[PDB]
Every structure is written in C-alpha cells, then in structure tokens.
Amino acid sequence: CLGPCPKVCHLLEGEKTIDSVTSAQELRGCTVINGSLIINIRGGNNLAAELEANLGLIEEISGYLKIRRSYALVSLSFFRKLRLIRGETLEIGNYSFYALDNQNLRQLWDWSKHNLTITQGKLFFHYNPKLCLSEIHKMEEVSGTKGRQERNDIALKTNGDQASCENELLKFSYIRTSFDKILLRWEPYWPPDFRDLLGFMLFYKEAPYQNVTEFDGQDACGSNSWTVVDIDPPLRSNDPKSQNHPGWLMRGLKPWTQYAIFVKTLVTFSDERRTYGAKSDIIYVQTDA
Amino acid sequence: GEVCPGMDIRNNLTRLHELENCSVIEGHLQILLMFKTRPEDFRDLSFPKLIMITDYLLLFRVYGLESLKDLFPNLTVIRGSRLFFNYALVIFEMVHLKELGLYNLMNITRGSVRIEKNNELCYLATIDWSRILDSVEDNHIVLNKDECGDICNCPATVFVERCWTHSHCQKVCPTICKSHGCTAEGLCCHSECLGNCSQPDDPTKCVACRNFYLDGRCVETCPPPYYHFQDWRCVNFSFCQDLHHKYVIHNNKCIPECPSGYTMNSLLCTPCLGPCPKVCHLLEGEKTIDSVTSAQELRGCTVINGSLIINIRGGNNLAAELEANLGLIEEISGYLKIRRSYALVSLSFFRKLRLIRGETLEIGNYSFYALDNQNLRQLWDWSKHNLTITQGKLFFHYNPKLCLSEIHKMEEVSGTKGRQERNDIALKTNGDQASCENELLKFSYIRTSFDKILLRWEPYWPPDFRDLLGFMLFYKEAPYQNVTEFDGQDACGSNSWTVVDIDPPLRSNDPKSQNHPGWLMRGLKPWTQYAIFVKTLVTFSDERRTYGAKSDIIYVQTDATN
Amino acid sequence: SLEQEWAKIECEVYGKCPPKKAYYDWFERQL
C-alpha cells in the first residue's frame, strides 16, 4: 500500500496463549497483534526456530506481553522485530511486560541491536533463574518505563540466580605454593562505597584437567563443585596507593595436586545502578611436591 | 562513702563532676584523650574521697596535668580483677606529666604496670615495686626520660632511697607489717587490715581490706546469708536479686550468670530438677534464624516461648549447625515459618520438635508456614517423627522439591486434618519439580526397527479409572546407559527427554484390564540407543491416593540399516 | 613458613595482629 497497512490480527477477548508450534503459527505474519500475548512453551525441546518463523514478524503488541513457565526458551529474540508493547490492555497489576518462572531464559532481546518501547504499563520479572539483572535493567531503560519512573516489580533475589554479571575482573598478583597450603593475593577491589564490600568469597576446586567453568556447578545443571571460603573485607587504607592486596591462605591441600581457583566479591545492593561486583578468572595452581 | 559504677570520661569535665562524693568504684576508670585540659584546670581539682579502684586505672594524653598527687591522693590499693590485657596501671603517651605522685600506694593485689612512650616523666627509678607487687617480672617500664635527678628521711631499699615526690617519701615498714598495714609510728594494723589504718589492731578503722568488706568491720569471708560480690564486699540476697531484676546464686555467691553446666531455676544454679525444662523468651514473640549465630542463640532452648522464622540463605547447607543448636527444641509456643531456604533440604534438624502450640499465629491463622524454600525436599521423617499442632492452619507454597506426599503426611500427624483445618497448601506449587509416582509400570513388550521402536507396558488404572488422564512416554538418546532418573528437569546433558502425551486405552473386557497400552516412536535414528520410560498422568484429588505410576528407564536400541 | 607469612598478612590486612599487639589494637580502635 501507500501508507501503512499492517496485518492486524485480532485476538479472542484480547488474549492468545502461544504454547506450541501450532499456537505460534496461528500468528504467522501478524505484524500487529491487537491483543495480549501469553507465551507458555512447554517441554525440553526448544522451538525458537519455529517461534521466529511465526512470531518473528510481529512488530507491535497492543496488549501486554507475558512469558510464563517457558522452559526451553533461552531467548526472547525470536520476537525478531517486536518494537512496541502498547499496553492498552494490561496484566493484572498494570504490567505491560510480564516474565515469570521462565526456567532457562538467559537473555531478552539483544539490546545492543534491538529496540522495544512500552507506551504504558509496568515491567514484571520473577523467578527467571538464568536471566541476569543487567539484561532486565537494560530493558527498563529501552522500554521507557524508567523514563517515566514505573515502579517495576522486578525482584533482585528471584532473577539471575544462576547467572554471573561481574563487569569488574579480579587479577591475582601473588600465588605462592606449598604441598598442603597455597597463599593467594588478588588485586585490591572496592565498590564506589567501600562498605558495600561485605567480603570476598574464594572458590577452589581440585581439577583433573584445566577445563572447569564457573557456571558449571553454580548452575542447577551441575552440583556445585567449589570450596566457598568466605573472606572478611580488608581494613581499608585512606591512600589508594596504600591499599594492600587482600589474600587468603587456603589450608589442607594435597601434594602436587592442581587446584582450579577463583575469587569473587560479595557486594550488597546499592539501589538504582548497583555498585557492581568483581570476579576473577579460573586459575590453576599445582601446589608443590 | 557512696557506691559508683565504672565510668569512662574523655574530655568531659562535666561528666567528671561525679566523683566528688564517691569512695569506691566497682569497675575501671578511664581518664584519657583530654586535650582542652590545662594546668589551671587541674590546680583546683582534687578527689580525696576515692580509695580503691577495682579493675584498673588508665591515663592517656591528658594535657596540662603535671602531677597526680593532688588529683587522686588517697588511692592505696587496687584489686585488679579485670585487667587491661594483663595490666593494672596504664601510663601511655604522657607528654606533660612530670611524676606519678601517688604517695599512698601500698600493695597491688593482681596485675602489672605499663609505662611506655612517656616523655618528661621523672621519679621512676625511686619506686620499689617489689614491696607493692608480688611478681614484678611482668612489669614493662621502658621508653621514658628517667637524666632526671630525683631528689627525695625516705627509706632505702635494694641501696637507693625510695620516694614518690620531692616532699613525700615511700611508706616502707618492717617485715612484721608485711600486708596488714602500718601506721606512722611503726605498729601493724589488724590481721585482716590492708595498706594503712587510723588505729592499730582495729578492723573497724581500715579503709582498704584484702578480704570482703561488710558493715565496717572487714571479714575474712562472708558469713551466710551474705554472698560474696566482686571479692571486696558482702551483699545480701535481696541486694543482688534487685540488681538482677533491672544475678544467680552459685557457690554462696550471686554471680551474674551460671557457669558451664548450670542455669537459673525458678536464682540458684542447678542443672536438672525433676523434668528439665528450658524456656527461651523471644522479643515481641518472633525470632528469625538466618545464620549459624541466629541458630546458636537458641542452643538448648527446649521450649520456644514465641514464633520461629527460618530464613537461611545461600547455597551453603547449615543443617549440621542447625541441628546442633535448634535440634533440642521440642516445643514452639508460636508458629513455625520456613522461608527462602535455598539450601535447607530437610527440616529434620528440628531433631525433637514435637509440638507447635500456635498460641501466636502467622497472619492467616497459620501455625506452620513454608514459602519459597527452593531445595526443601522433606520435612521431618514422619516414619519416625511426631509433631502435633494445637491450633492454627498449615501453609505450603512454592516449595519446588518438597513433594505433597511429605506435606499430606504432616496434615495427618499435625492433627490439622483431624480438626478439618482449611490448610492453604498450593497443590501445584509444592513438589512440581519432583516426580513422586509410587506405583510401577513394566514394559510388557518391546519391538524395535531401524527407524521405530514399538513399546507396550502393563495396564494401569487408578482406584477410579476416570482419574487417569493418560500416559506420558519420555524418550531420549542414550549413547551410555548412565541416564539418571527424570527429576523434573530432564538431565544436565544437552540431550533432553522428549515428552509424548498418550491418551489412555479403552476400558474393556475382563477386570484383568486386557488392554496393554502402547506407543510407536518413529522419529528415531539407526544404530542409536534410546532411554525410554513411561509416566502416568492422573487427576489429583482429595481421594489422596491417585499418585500414579512410573516405569524405570529402559535402554532400547534401534536396528542398523545402510 | 607460609603460615608465618600470612600471620603477618592477617595483621597487615585484617588487623589480626598478635596478642602482644592486641593492646596496641585498642589504642588504634579508640578514637
């Protein structure tokens, strides 16, 4: 046409539940959804390919968008060009975007590329174990909800249980080795407010090979395989050039056995933009003969 | 005189205006960090009523002060029960002090002297600590000015003359007056006396005594019913009892707390009288346990006179410490709530909790409350344990790994079902992640092809066949027969269970149910080994027994074609 | 020894100084 003429697809009573391929295919080519969309994908089988072939042309949702109990869906990016959630109808609680119990959701849209404005309504995020807080906070800024001070119900404890989002990187400056004790010292790390550092937490696991990953064990997939040695915060110096490198002497090791080790910061929430925490890479130390 | 507690005054003359009419102090006196103080301030300050300090005396950075002979002149003896790191006299960083001046110091019962980094101090070598302290080996007197030229009639001991100031000698009396005191003429005081007395051979004229003081005449030991207190006075039973009520009797001495292995019985410290009950009272009827320290606060609290909240967080299991501390609680007078227990897999650390009285209840009239416990897998072992609830409802929500079987057994043990409590137990938020099918399905007949596997299993029907919604066949690649059972999350390996819903067969023929259900899988690959099991899909209800059946995993293989 | 090196470190970083310096620790804590 000359002038826009999108394929508006009208939903029964303003809601449509997408559970399988057939439910998604019913919205194939529906560039505008004149209702609310519920995604409830079930089963350990990922349908992201079929969801993008069918839902990936939707660019507007006139109602709310809810993703609840989506197991195999690791990403909402199958909404390949969803740019607007008008929120004319809202999920109870005045929510325009809703995300609950999504067990393997790792990311939303790629906010480095994608845009998604919300005309009205709040954001909701609960019990998304893999989805990081940073992924959600970027949505609050892109969606304009933060730009209109929406009291988004996004519980910090319930999301990003398994994920790790430490922008800062800790580097070990001292690795002395004995047959049963290793002395480590990492760089000094401090949040903007030094009191937000409640402490460090060392994580050392004896490794047969140098292939251990921090996400392994931390995630529910693998049982946790690290020694969570929590460490008190260091007595801070006024002079930044006199901040001694904190460290720990982990005890009771085995002779010439290789340990996989990393250290992480325990930083309390500071509201708004978090002061953020730091984490070291996995380092391998062979102790001594 | 009067009785005054321990005071810590720093840079506060107004706070100081309190020792003008007091004689003894049952603590420590710390005058330090005084920089505004000036000689003019001190020249008109004197406290001759103070006699003995119990714990210790500490002096630090007191400007303007040059001599202590006029501030505290009548100090004679120091007990030294509570020592400041094994020290009874602390003299540190005195930039304006010239001499000690304490010309009335006689003996030190317990403790040492600490003199370090004190400039401009003199008259240090003229003090005989041997006649004052029993063991001068722990004395630390270094880093001082003492050429001073101490000019003292004064006695001379091992020979150097002993004196405190230029006009006051050191009181050194013969051996016979070793500890009983001594007057100016050279006669010892009463056998119970100490330091100095006004009249020789008189126990009612001594201001300082080694033994306990009682009614002027110092006594060797406190006669009943006077209990020892602080090792210097003999207070009555009603005296230290009032101090306890805004102190417990033990070995003829009302001490603040009983030693290890004793407790107050309603004062006397005794451990078991008849049945032994410990009642721990909670602030405003609630106490939250989140860490080892919060649990240890309830160690041995057999009876909790309040409500208990468990909020343990983090992945580190504290069940061992929780059982060492909470595992002796046998009654909770309030409600019991468990919330956000990420790591706690079992409440069995309440090793002998038998009753939840529910006198106070969680809002909603709940006596037991369980919410958001991520890894709670079981409650108490109801095969062994008992736990009655006197009143109040049960609450269970969002306990993903706690199967409803454990919850329903609690409803029957706790008596809530026995009084028809409308327990708020969310049937599909507790134990959803855990399959609790207790009956078994066996694959009666297996047949395989290069692309397909035909399976049949034994027929199954709940007590009411209408409660059977169907079956669920789970199949997955299994190159190794190590596939762990389906635990509500498939497996950690990238391969995931393929769920196939199967509507139930036709109820037909004999009550033998001669209709073996079956399914034909078709999307399979040759050479490939597959793990398969079948689960039932059954309508749950207050029939309370339609738990369903589940097969063991079988590792069928397909045929191999070119 | 390695423990001795950390003994010093504990005092240096965490303020866990020997019992002989516990007395000095109080003065640092004061004010």
Numbering used by the authors:
A (entry chain B): 304 to 592
B (entry chain C): 5 to 150, 154 to 159, 168 to 173, 178 to 265, 277 to 296, 299 to 594
C (entry chain A): 1 to 31
According to the publication:
The human insulin receptor (hIR) is an [αβ]2 homodimeric receptor tyrosine kinase that upon insulin binding signals into metabolic pathways that effect glucose homeostasis. Insulin binding brings about extensive conformational change in the receptor extracellular region that in turn effects trans-activation of the intracellular tyrosine kinase domains and downstream signalling. Whereas biological activity of both Site 1 and Site 2 peptides in isolation is minimal, [Site 2]-[Site 1] fusion peptides are IR agonists, with the most potent reported being S519. Here, we present single-particle cryoEM structures that show how a 33-mer polypeptide unrelated to insulin can cross-link two sites on the receptor surface and direct the receptor into a signalling-active conformation.
We show, using single-particle cryo-electron microscopy (“cryoEM”), that IM459 cross-links hIR domain L1 to hIR domain FnIII-1′ and, in so doing, releases constraints on the membrane-proximal hIR domain pairs [FnIII-2]-[FnIII-3] and [FnIII-2′]-[FnIII-3′]. The resultant three-dimensional (3D) map displayed pseudo-C2 symmetry, refinement with imposed C2 symmetry led to maps with ill-defined receptor domains. We thus undertook focussed refinement, masking the region corresponding to domains L1, CR, L2, FnIII-1, L2 and FnIII-1′—this process resulted in a map of ca 5.0 Å resolution (with detail in Methods, Supplementary Fig. 3 and Supplementary Table 1). The map was then interpretable as comprising (i) the four-domain [L2-(FnIII-1)]2 module of the receptor, (ii) an L1-CR module, adjacent to domain L2 and with domain L1 in proximity to domain FnIII-1′, and (iii) a considerably more mobile [L1-CR]′ module on the opposite side of the two-fold axis. Two tube-like density features were then visible, sandwiched between the juxtaposed surfaces of domains L1 and FnIII-1′. Attempts to improve the resolution of this focus-refined structure failed, likely due to flexibility in the linker between two components of the peptide and the resultant slight mobility of domain L1 with respect to domain FnIII-1′. The relative disorder of the [L1-CR]′ module and domain FnIII-1 with respect to the remainder of the structure may reflect individual IM459 peptides being unable to cross-link domains L1 and FnIII-1′ and domains L1′ and FnIII-1 simultaneously; alternatively, IM459 peptides may be able to simultaneously cross-link domain L1 to domain FnIII-1′ and domain L1′ to domain FnIII-1 but, in so doing, destabilize the central [L2-(FnIII-1)]2 module. The relative conformation of the focus-refined hIR-Aecto domains reflects that of the insulin-bound receptor, in that the L1-CR module is displaced away from its apo-interaction with domain FnIII-2′ and directed instead towards the receptor “head”. The relative positioning of domains L1 and FnIII-1′ is, however, distinct from that seen in the site 1 to site 2 cross-linked halves of the three-insulin-bound structures of hIR reported recently.
